[PDB]
């Protein structure tokens with residue numbers, strides 16, 4: 296019936312911000328080679344204040360060279376004694392975010408680790424000091440090379456924590472003058488971190504935030520008892536149609552209401568990865584076509600704005616928040632300066648399902664809501680109004696509501712799948728750029744000779760590594776192949792996902808079915824080394840081990856194989872070939888209907904080999920194991 300909003304009895308918990316995740320894994324892969332002005336426009340919609348999603352928080356993966364859901368991300372230390380703070384795109388992303396919002400909050404978290412940290416095992420807690428040293432290098436690098444202050448550091452994404460590691464990490468941070476950096480744990484479930492904090496005073500002292508993943512808007516008693524800030528440190532992960540926006544809308548409100556969570560962070564920031572990779576199009580917006588410049592400002596952008604444009608970290612929740620009588624919810628916040636923001640959501644069950652978890656049915660129906668401002672809120676008699684309807688009108692500013700009544704009260708008519716923001720703030724704005732170019736398939740003819748002397752990013756565009764790491768490589772001691780692409784891992788990472796046994800980078804249009812792929816390849820390991828080119832590669836990311844297609848392998852022992860799978864269990868053809876290590880060869884692979892052929896240096900090696908059909912997928916390059924190899928003059932012609 297009537298809902299009292301008051302502050303005379305005090306405030307709720309401090310609000311900590313809304314954010315999103317770039318990483319886990321390579322979710323921002325295709326954003327970096329967007330032409331201007333589009334790339335800058337995309338970033339504005341994400342990070343520019345009073346414009347779009349206007350995010351308060353940016354969380355990034357600390358790359359560990361392993362596969363971490365939609366690709367691998369390069370580490371700052373591939374090997375022992377190796378340090379490089381200019382690989383990948385998270386440095387760039389954080390810097391672009393900070394340019395637009397100097398007050399943005401920055402977080403780092405590892406998914407995987409380079410293999411050498413394991414000292415013989417696939418385990419990051421073998422040498423606590425070594426692993427902490429690795430992580431702290433990254434934070435120092437952020438400051439020293441990019442002028443970035445990292446605000447929070449996590450432990451090991453959705454993986455066991457080690458209490459002694461967390462303590463060593465704190466000691467190491469302090470030792471390097473990073474007392475300011477806060478620790479969030481354990482980016483998994485509420486337990487066992489929450490009970491661990493109650494039982495261990497020393498652990499309690501060094502953990503600042505309990506961050507939980509996909510909590511379904513609820514927390515647990517031990518977490519409440521801890522007295523720690525509680526965050527949904529990863530949520531959402533749902534296709535950014537209207538249903539995803541509904542899910543985002545509902546949990547943004549009810550994570551605090553039901554679970555006392557004062558921050559929610561969406562995976563992921565922007566869908567800049569091939570849509571046929573796992574969890575395709577699960578970003579706040581979509582930007583998966585750098586070749587065309589086409590991007591989509593999806594509904595979740597404006598769902599975000601309803602909170603972010605009218606709240607900042609450091610505001611407080613009112614004690615008076617809750618559910619609506621006929622379904623839906625409301626929250627309210629103030630800044631302690633006279634401002635007030637009210638956020639109301641009525642998302643229906645059929646239009647707000649998240650993937651994790653799925654909620655049992657709940658009813659939502661039309662209703663009236665009366666709000667009465669008590670305490671220091673009564674003195675307010677003007678509120679700006681912002682409105683969104685899903686299923687559609689987005690972030691439209693309505694006529695100002697007046698409370699000149701003296702009643703300090705007002706009433707709203709609510710339907711299903713709606714969002715209302717009522718605020719004293721006058722800075723709201725539905726940011727707008729002209730429409731971007733229409734969607735277009737990946738170019739049916741495509742080439743890259745990798746001839747770039749001072750590349751802006753460490754890897755050639757559109758190549759999405761799914762196991763191993765591929766980089767621009769300059770070799771002064773060779774004129775013909777001075778600038779190539781090199782796979783640089785020489786051992787399996789401490790894995791997060793199930794990385795393939797072979798390295799592989801995919802590129803192009805997953806719809807491609809008839810195609811010709813050509814590349815120069817160079818095997819660096821004598822006797823045992825091997826490389827391939829491939830087409831119709833149908834799976835990647837977390838499922839990269841499941842990839843089928845047509846794979847043309849050559850080996851340094853003078854042999855070749857044609858397989859249906861990346862794992863090489865299934866044979867199409869095999870034989871001998873004049874191939875050794877440390878010599879450049881040109882490979883061609885043609886696939887058309889039921890048949891494939893392969894060429895070595897322009898000369899047929901095999902032809903009319905029968906392959907599964909119908910079938911479709913990307914083109915790819917790679918190496919037999921985690922071994923050095925180079926690639927040059929890549930070309931693909933394909934019919935979609």
Ligand SMILES: *[C@@H]1O[C@H](CO)[C@@H](O[C@@H]2O[C@H](CO)[C@@H](O)[C@H](O)[C@H]2NC(C)=O)[C@H](O)[C@H]1NC(C)=O
Nearest residue numbers: 307308519520522551552553554555556614617
């Ligand atoms: C966090 O959780 C809940 C909110 O879901 C709060 O607990 C009580 O909520 C009921 C209504 O749901 C109120 O009538 C009570 O007054 C609340 N408890 C208290 C002590 O005020 C809870 O307060 C929030 N905070 C904590 C520390 O649990």
Ligand SMILES: *[C@@H]1O[C@H](CO)[C@@H](O[C@@H]2O[C@H](CO)[C@@H](O)[C@H](O)[C@H]2NC(C)=O)[C@H](O)[C@H]1NC(C)=O
Nearest residue numbers: 607629630631632633634635675719720721722
């Ligand atoms: C609401 O918030 C705005 C923005 O924070 C407040 O305006 C600021 O007030 C401080 C001092 O309190 C000044 O130093 C800033 O220059 C002001 N900024 C702007 C953009 O006006 C405002 O006082 C708050 N309260 C109300 C009732 O609007």
Ligand SMILES: *[C@@H]1O[C@H](CO)[C@@H](O[C@@H]2O[C@H](CO)[C@@H](O)[C@H](O)[C@H]2NC(C)=O)[C@H](O)[C@H]1NC(C)=O
Nearest residue numbers: 807808809810886887888889890908933934935
């Ligand atoms: C890929 O190539 C196959 C084989 O050439 C094409 O399938 C043939 O298409 C022609 C004309 O469309 C038909 O007359 C044949 O009967 C088809 N053969 C088979 C085995 O299906 C296929 O259409 C091509 N696809 C694309 C997208 O170019």
Ligand SMILES: *[C@@H]1O[C@H](CO)[C@@H](O)[C@H](O)[C@H]1NC(C)=O
Nearest residue numbers: 621622656657658659660661
């Ligand atoms: C939802 O509530 C309305 C009003 O109480 C009722 O008419 C309707 O049947 C309910 N729907 C379901 C699925 O319970």
Ligand SMILES: O=C1NC[C@H](CO)[C@H](O)[C@@H]1O
Nearest residue numbers: 319320363364532562574
């Ligand atoms: O950490 C994660 N957790 C789950 C996401 C998918 O829902 C994604 O795999 C992400 O990397």
Ligand SMILES: [Ca+2]
Nearest residue numbers: 744746778927
């Ligand atoms: Ca070259």
